[PDB]
Amino acid sequence: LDAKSDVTNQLVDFQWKLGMAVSSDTCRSLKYPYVAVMLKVADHSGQVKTKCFEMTIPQFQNFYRQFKEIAAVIETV
Amino acid sequence: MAALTAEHFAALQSLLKASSKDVVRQLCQESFSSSALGLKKLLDVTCSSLSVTQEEAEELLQALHRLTRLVAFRDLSSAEAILALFPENFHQNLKNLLTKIILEHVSTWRTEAQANQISLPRLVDLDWRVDIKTSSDSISRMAVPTCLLQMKIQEDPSLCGDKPSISAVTVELSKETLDTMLDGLGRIRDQLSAVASK
Amino acid sequence: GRVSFLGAQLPPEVAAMARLLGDLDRSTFRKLLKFVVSSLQGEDCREAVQRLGVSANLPEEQLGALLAGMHTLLQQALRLPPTSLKPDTFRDQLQELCIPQDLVGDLASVVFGSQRPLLDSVAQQQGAWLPHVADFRWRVDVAISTSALARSLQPSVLMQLKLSDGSAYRFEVPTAKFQELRYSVALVLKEMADLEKRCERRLQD
Amino acid sequence: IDMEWKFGVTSGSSELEKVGSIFLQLKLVVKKGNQTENVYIELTLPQFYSFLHEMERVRTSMECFC
Amino acid sequence: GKSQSRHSAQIHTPVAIIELELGKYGQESEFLCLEFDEVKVNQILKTLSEVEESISTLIS
Amino acid sequence: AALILRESPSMKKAVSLINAIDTGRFPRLLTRILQKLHLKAESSFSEEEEEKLQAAFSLEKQDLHLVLETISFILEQAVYHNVKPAALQQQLENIHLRQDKAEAFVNTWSSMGQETVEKFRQRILAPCKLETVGWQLNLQMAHSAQAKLKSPQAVLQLGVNNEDSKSLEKVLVEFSHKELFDFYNKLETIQAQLDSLT
Amino acid sequence: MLLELSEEHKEHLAFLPQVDSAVVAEFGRIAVEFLRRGANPKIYEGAARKLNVSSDTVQHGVEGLTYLLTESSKLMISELDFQDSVFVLGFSEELNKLLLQLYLDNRKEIRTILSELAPSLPSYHNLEWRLDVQLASRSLRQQIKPAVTIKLHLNQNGDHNTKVLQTDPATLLHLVQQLEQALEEMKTNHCRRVVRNIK
Amino acid sequence: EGTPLWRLQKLPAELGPQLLHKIIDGICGRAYPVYQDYHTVWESEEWMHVLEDIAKFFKAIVGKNLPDEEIFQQLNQLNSLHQETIMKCVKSRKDEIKQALSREIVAISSAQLQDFDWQVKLALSSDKIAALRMPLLSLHLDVKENGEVKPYSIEMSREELQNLIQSLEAANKVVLQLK
Amino acid sequence: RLTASSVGQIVGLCSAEIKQIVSEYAEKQSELSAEESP
């Protein structure tokens, strides 16, 4: 059980959802869009975790742009 | 439970009931390794074969384990040294048998003990993978060496609960830290060599 | 004009049982007494009791009271040593009123039988509050060099300890602290010997 | 970030009266995120020598490009 | 850009490292690290592109 | 390879800055450090103390902090090698240090040098240490399942300092006469082990 | 049993005999202060400033006197034994009387201070009980299941710990019956003999 | 290597519906088919693979709501009989798969509520007073967080219960119109 | 401190493995130092 390819983590699946918050106890017209993500990741033990977090539209587009730049840079060399 | 008393030795006047020495050697090699998992097999073997209760097995295990531990602790490599530990009236036809059994297999116990010494978690395996940092978010490009040392650790099951608790770690180094590491380790190696040659 | 070992005022459990066991035969009572004894060593014997109740057509409300009475009576009886409870006083307190004559023999046999050593041995094991030491292993080192010192040359001791609770502890122990621990242990041994001596001299007057 | 070591010799144990087993202890101050963690390890003589040789190899390979 | 390892003597395949700053309001932040190669990065880019398309088509 | 001093531009800047300050402010802090060089959580200089020292020097905290770090490193090297004061007097002056600094260094090194090495000699690296010992003696006379007892009993408390967590735990143990005698015999054996190093 | 003093500790008591009782009383007051309000070596600086007296030997003397007081109150030895013990120090009879009186007047407070050094064990603090009967659930609507709620408070090394429990009338009766037996042994011949012959 | 269902050919036409429908039942929340029923036809280490392949294929097909032909064409190279079994299985219990998928969407969060139970009681007397007569509602919750089920308990009186019901009804006035 | 005899006395134990390990490490130079530029 020793492999260089896996050092820290490697996500095995990627799921997401799109929804918007309509109302809240402190505000009846909250009404803002949001986007969530669920990551299940595997460590050296061979197990599978589950990490989920929520984002906004500007944060999501920043995420997408950064991954695009990463793809370009990795492709070039 | 007791010390090296007549209780143990007189209780040891029951070991001739076996016909084959293989059972004797199995008992010898499982009593020296006293533990909850390793004791239960002795309990089952004795109760099933010798048709005795639990006390006759437990006290006999106590005696045999204590004898093995004592001889390993003292490193009694001469048969006459073991002869000093017995009374005259205790069975000599069994005393000589025990002496020969102990003498034949001493090195196994002497060596296997050193692998069970208490200690901090011990390395068992490592791997490394040099990497180059071509680009990052805060800088478009570079070419910088980097190291990724990965290691394996085995901790005693007792100190963590019921788990084996074997963990893996990864540390990302740079040039200066590696240089300091190597200088210190080379200094230690030079000290060891000087001691050897002195 | 004596005080029974069962307390100044008889508990309701045993008092009620006195009327209940006046019609049961000897064999069923003996089986129940055997089951109660087997319970005192910590074994689970519920199913056999249920089978006995089913066989003998006994309401649970009466079987439970009978079992409680016997268990409490025997527990209070076994607290004292045989030196503090003679058979004479025993059956005299057991005085026939609401009592069979043929069961006290079984009571004496169970109390004064070959099972009494086992009951005392397990009973002795009930007097414990805090964990006991299960094992003790050590390792003495001799530090030759260190990062902060070219040559240390400081003896040290590594200690590991396990307890019946399942706790495992490992720690270092320098020499001075070890000497303190050894002196404390010796002092405790000496004071324990002093108490052992005083117990005989200060209570046999 | 930081490292420490201790090199010493064993002179006995619970089950062996006399033994001269050498050992080495390490402490690694690794920056586990915003917090800090310490990793304590023990090595034997051959393992320490192999570790030193592997670090020498890594130093050789880490200065190839520049 | 990977170079080599303990046993392997020559490697060129690149990787990407991303660390995520996650934390619920009023609590200490956690960090998550991940590894990637070309194929997985392409798959993640495709999934994010589908997310964007779904965002676009639901306005009308 | 063969250099007790790692001369570098940082040290050149350090000697350039240090050589200017007069002898009237050097010895106090330098002696204040030797008693606390065995700690790395912080120096002997609190926020207000370093503030007033900064006001006296009237430079940025960076400069005085770097100078203090360099002095601490020099002292750490000296205690690492256990050098005689003559070695200091000879070598520090070689790197363009004015004589007042050298005398302040050498006098302080002569003052409390062996105390520092003795302090380091008792340093420990493992994350757990035994710090305090306490015990209580009781006589048990009766309990639920028995009565008319005259049995002594003992309790020991062990102060284990969890230096990893900067916290202290306590272990509660209980003994009888036989168990305590066995423990005492084990400790005596350990003592006999420690007596081979005379 | 008797304070047969150690030679090295005695050497630290040489400062007081060369000092008048007027400052020995102040040193005893300082020992009481060190026990109660804590120790501050800055008081050595104050003493040097106000008396031009070396701090090291003053610290030695105060610590030695405090140690004597602590190990004298730690045993509750009678006054005659204390007088016999200090007869070897070559001290003035007035100073001996002052020491004996100072020790005498501050024994109970010291023993109150020392009792916090023993091993800390869980200890009872308070108990609260509530009675309730279950009437309905999500599966049964008409029920009668009486139970007794208990909140037990325990103190461990200076903290407050709470436990939430439950019990039934028969078990509560058994608990009371057993605990009544628990505090009935101390009125018996064995316990009386043990507690009387010892003191 | 073609559609993930390629590993299903080894199983004859007769034992298809049982495996498929029991797998769908396992997806919905019931038990999954056991090894000792079809062990002769597959190996465990690959039985797990085929199980996962079938489950994920069904989930994707139901979620994306493909038309008849595209589902039909993907199964062209299967057994002459398995194709109709698969299509009929999709046609029969598509709604259960959709319900399970919608439930799993709520799994995208820190914690989820699994189930609960409430008990009502009448407090009669306490150490403070012996005329209490306080009705108390006990609410038990089993909420799954991370990867474990954490139980919780809440004790409420009439006022707290009324306020909670009021807030939940305020939320329900939005939930009902959002549909 | 550990007296100079103890410094000498420590030799009586560790020489069992130091003698072999240092010699082998010098022999390990065949793969470490003797030939690394083939």
Curated annotation (Swiss-Prot), chain A:
Q: Does the UniProt entry include the keyword Acetylation?
A: yes
Localization, UniProt? Nucleus; Cytoplasm
Q: Which InterPro entries match?
A: COMM, COMMD4/6/7/8
Q: What are the recorded Gene Ontology BP terms?
A: negative regulation of NF-kappaB transcription factor activity; signal transduction
| GO molecular function per UniProt | NF-kappaB binding
Tissue localization of expression: Ubiquitous. Expressed in brain, heart, skeletal muscle, lung, pancreas, liver, kidney, small intestine and placenta.
- Tell me the function of this protein: Scaffold protein in the commander complex that is essential for endosomal recycling of transmembrane cargos; the commander complex is composed of the CCC subcomplex and the retriever subcomplex. May modulate activity of cullin-RING E3 ubiquitin ligase (CRL) complexes. Down-regulates activation of NF-kappa-B. Inhibits TNF-induced NFKB1 activation.
Identify this protein by name. Answer: COMM domain-containing protein 6
Q: Which lineage?
A: Eukaryota, Metazoa, Chordata, Craniata, Vertebrata
From Swiss-Prot, chain E:
**Residues reported to bind Cu cation:** 7
Please tell me in which tissues this protein is expressed.
Ubiquitous. Highest expression in the liver, with lower expression in brain, lung, placenta, pancreas, small intestine, heart, skeletal muscle, kidney and placenta. Down-regulated in cancer tissues.
Record PTM text: Acetylated by EP300 ina stimuli-specific manner; protecting it from XIAP-mediated proteasomal degradation and required for interaction with RElA in response to stress.
Segments carrying the region annotation (Required for binding to PtdIns(4,5)P2) are 1-60
* Limits of the COMM domain: 1-59
Keywords recorded for this protein, A-Z: Acetylation, Copper, Cytoplasm, Cytoplasmic vesicle, Endosome, Lipid-binding, Membrane, Metal-binding, Nucleus, Protein transport, Transcription, Transcription regulation, Transport, Ubl conjugation, Ubl conjugation pathway
Gene Ontology biological-process entries? cholesterol homeostasis; copper ion homeostasis; Golgi to plasma membrane transport; low-density lipoprotein particle clearance; negative regulation of hypoxia-inducible factor-1alpha signaling pathway; negative regulation of NF-kappaB transcription factor activity; negative regulation of protein localization to cell surface; negative regulation of sodium ion transmembrane transport
Task: Give any GO molecular function from the UniProt entry.
Answer: phosphatidylinositol-3,4-bisphosphate binding
A single GO cellular-component term from the record reads: cytoplasm
Question: Could you say which protein family the record assigns here?
Answer: Belongs to the COMM domain-containing protein 1 family.
Name recorded for this polypeptide: COMM domain-containing protein 1
Swiss-Prot record, chain F:
Report keywords, A-Z. Answer: Acetylation, Cytoplasm, Nucleus, Phosphoprotein, Transcription, Transcription regulation, Ubl conjugation pathway
Subunit note = Component of the commander complex consisting of the CCC subcomplex and the retriever subcomplex. Component of the CCC (COMMD/CCDC22/CCDC93) subcomplex consisting of COMMD1, COMMD2, COMMD3, COMMD4, COMMD5, COMMD6, COMMD7, COMMD8, COMMD9, COMMD10, CCDC22 and CCDC93; within the complex forms a heterodimer with COMMD5. Interacts with RELA, RELB, NFKB1/p105, NFKB2/p100. Interacts with CCDC22, CCDC93, SCNN1B, CUL1, CUL2, CUL3, CUL4A, CUL4B, CUL7.
Q: In which tissues is it expressed?
A: Ubiquitous.
Domain called COMM: residue spans: 129-198
The family database entries (PROSITE patterns) matched by this protein are listed as: COMM
Q: Tell me the protein family, please.
A: Belongs to the COMM domain-containing protein 10 family.
Which cysteines does the record link by disulfide bonds?
Answer: none
Localization per record: Cytoplasm; Nucleus
Q: What is this protein called?
A: COMM domain-containing protein 10
| Keyword Acetylation recorded | yes
- Can you tell which superkingdom this protein's organism belongs to? Eukaryota
Q: What is its main location?
A: cytoplasm
Q: Does the keyword Cytoplasm apply?
A: yes
Record's GO cellular component terms: cytoplasm; nucleoplasm
The job of this chain, per UniProt, is described as:
Scaffold protein in the commander complex that is essential for endosomal recycling of transmembrane cargos; the commander complex is composed of the CCC subcomplex and the retriever subcomplex. May modulate activity of cullin-RING E3 ubiquitin ligase (CRL) complexes. May down-regulate activation of NF-kappa-B.
The record ties this protein, via Pfam families, to:
COMM_domain, COMM_HN
- Carrying Phosphoserine, the residues are 151
Q: Which organism is it from?
A: Homo sapiens
From Swiss-Prot, chain I:
Question: Residue positions of the PTM Phosphoserine?
Answer: 30, 33, 37
Q: Which branch of life, at top level? A: Eukaryota
* Cystines in this chain: none
Localization annotation: Early endosome
The protein's role, per its UniProt record:
Component of the commander complex that is essential for endosomal recycling of transmembrane cargos; the commander complex is composed of composed of the CCC subcomplex and the retriever subcomplex. Component of the CCC complex, which is involved in the regulation of endosomal recycling of surface proteins, including integrins, signaling receptor and channels. The CCC complex associates with SNX17, retriever and WASH complexes to prevent lysosomal degradation and promote cell surface recycling of numerous cargos such as integrins ITGA5:ITGB1.
What's the family? Belongs to the CCDC93 family.
State how it assembles. Component of the commander complex consisting of the CCC subcomplex and the retriever subcomplex. Component of the CCC (COMMD/CCDC22/CCDC93) subcomplex consisting of COMMD1, COMMD2, COMMD3, COMMD4, COMMD5, COMMD6, COMMD7, COMMD8, COMMD9, COMMD10, CCDC22 and CCDC93. Forms a coiled-coil heterodimer with CCDC22; this heterodimer interacts with the guanine nucleotide exchange factor DENND10; the interaction is direct. Interacts with WASHC1. Interacts directly with WASHC2C. Interacts with SNX17 and SNX31.
* This protein's name: Coiled-coil domain-containing protein 93
Q: Which lineage?
A: Eukaryota, Metazoa, Chordata, Craniata, Vertebrata
